[PDB]
């Protein structure tokens, strides 16, 4: 019995003496031996703390011999390494030596100099990161990092989903390439002009002439009620290469109607657009941006909001319209305008010129969202 215990102790020293500091103590009836890793000439504090925590709370051991030790592993993040902690318990009261180990009892992320690396350091702003985590979390802090995914305690979350607030400097070659793709797309200078509440026979034709003059396309979210009597004009919008979307039949606050009456405001418009145009873009913009999860979840359409309100409907002033666009438009913006009043008709040329002068490419909503478009989903911009 004594010789067998001596053999286990010799084996562990042969295996782990180098690069570790060995602590030995009796805790009740249990005999504990812990090998703490050294970073340089000093014990990695957070690893010892993790082990001490186990000793205090779990541990428990009646008559046993308990070993703790670690191994360094890459973390999958640049300049960060992991210390995996193993705990092994030997039962010697038995005729035969029994043992059980937990290979990854715990784990600590560390900087190359042995200091703690916490999940908040992976971001340029923890507050927001926490927020996005919460989301992708809810839909689907001790963590791991593997194959381009963040793993919490397990739930594997793509690292991609937090690129907006991540400290990309921590990404290795592969993830750095993925980030480059994200960055390049994020910085593509595209904008989608959108026009609501039409068609209006007295203003829409002028808007179409102006878009044609400037060689750009737009997306028109039309009211079902305005289609009757203006069928040729709606066909004209589509023949000029613009995308026609659904703005409800008569512009009520959809969230204040019963579910089926709201759905029908939408489907009646899909029906008349399909009858006149032969097809639907399956894009729907709620009047006033008012919508509910139930409505969205009830229809196979993508709901298109906006991130830039030109306020043309409020200001009714060309100079104001241009100023709002100049200050608000961003990469991937969806601009809300109305092709039913003259101020917008008049301001359109200077708005287009300004944006072209700043290097923007004008795109339709389908061009902007292309692969991101899914039924039931809400979209405020290319990325939000
Ligand atoms: Zn074992
Ligand atoms: Zn409207
Ligand atoms: Zn569905």
From Swiss-Prot:
SUPFAM superfamilies found in the cross-reference section: Glycoside hydrolase/deacetylase (SSF88713), Peptidoglycan deacetylase N-terminal noncatalytic region (SSF144015)
Residues of the site described as Raises pKa of active site His: 312
Keyword Transmembrane helix: yes
Record-listed substrate binding positions: 288
Disulfide-bonded cysteines: none
EC code: 3.5.1.104
Keywords in alphabetical order: Carbohydrate metabolism, Cell membrane, Cobalt, Hydrolase, Membrane, Metal-binding, Transmembrane, Transmembrane helix, Virulence, Zinc
Active site (record annotation): 196, 338
A Pfam cross-reference name: Polysacc_deac_1
Cofactor(s) annotated in UniProt: Zn(2+); Co(2+)
Record membrane topology: Single-pass membrane protein
Cofactor binding comment, as recorded: Zn(2+). Although displays higher activity with Co(2+) than with Zn(2+) in vitro, bioavailability may well limit this enzyme to be zinc-dependent.
Its biological purpose: Catalyzes the deacetylation of N-acetylglucosamine (GlcNAc) residues in peptidoglycan, a modification that confers host lysozyme resistance and contributes to pneumococcal virulence.
The name this protein goes by in its record: Peptidoglycan-N-acetylglucosamine deacetylase
């Amino acid at each position: 019995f004594e010789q067998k215990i001596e053999s286990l102790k010799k084996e562990k020293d042969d295996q782990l003496s180098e690069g570790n500091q060995k602590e030995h103590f009796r805790q009740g009836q249990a005999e504990v031996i812990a090998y703490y890793p050294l970073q340089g000439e000093k014990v990695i504090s957070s690893v010892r703390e993790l082990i001490n925590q186990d000793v205090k709370d779990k541990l428990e051991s009646k008559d046993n011999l308990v070993f703790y030790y670690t191994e360094q592993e890459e973390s999958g993040l640049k300049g960060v390494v992991n210390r995996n902690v193993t705990k092994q318990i030997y039962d010697l009261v038995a005729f035969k030596i029994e043992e059980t180990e937990k290979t990854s009892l715990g784990k600590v992320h560390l900087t190359e100099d042995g200091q703690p690396f916490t999940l908040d350091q992976l971001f340029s702003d923890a507050s927001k990161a926490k927020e996005q985590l919460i989301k992708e979390l809810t839909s689907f802090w001790n963590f791991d990092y593997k194959d381009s995914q963040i793993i919490l305690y397990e739930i594997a979350l793509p690292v991609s989903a937090f690129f907006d607030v991540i400290q990309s400097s921590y990404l290795l070659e592969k993830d750095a390439a993925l980030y480059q793709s994200y960055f390049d797309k994020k910085h593509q200078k595209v904008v989608a002009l959108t026009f609501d509440d039409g068609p209006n026979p007295a203003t829409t034709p002028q808007v179409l002439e102006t878009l044609a003059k400037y060689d750009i396309k737009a997306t028109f979210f039309v009211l079902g009620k305005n289609v009757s009597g203006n069928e040729d004009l709606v066909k004209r919008i589509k023949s000029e290469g613009h995308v026609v979307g659904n703005h409800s039949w008569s512009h009520p606050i959809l969230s204040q109607l019963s579910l089926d009456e709201a759905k029908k405001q939408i489907t009646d418009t899909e029906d008349v657009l399909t009858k006149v145009l032969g097809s639907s873009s399956k894009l729907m913009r709620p009047p006033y941006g008012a919508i509910t999860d139930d409505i969205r979840n009830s229809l196979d359409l993508s709901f298109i909001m906006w991130d830039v309100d030109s306020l043309d409907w409020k200001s009714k002033n060309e100079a104001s319209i241009l100023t709002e666009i100049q200050h608000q438009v961003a990469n991937g913006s969806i601009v809300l305008m109305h092709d039913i009043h003259s101020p917008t008709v008049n301001a359109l040329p200077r708005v287009i010129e300004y944006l072209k002068n700043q290097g923007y490419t004008f795109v339709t909503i389908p061009e902007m969202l292309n692969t991101r478009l899914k039924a039931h989903e809400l979209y405020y911009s290319r990325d939000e």
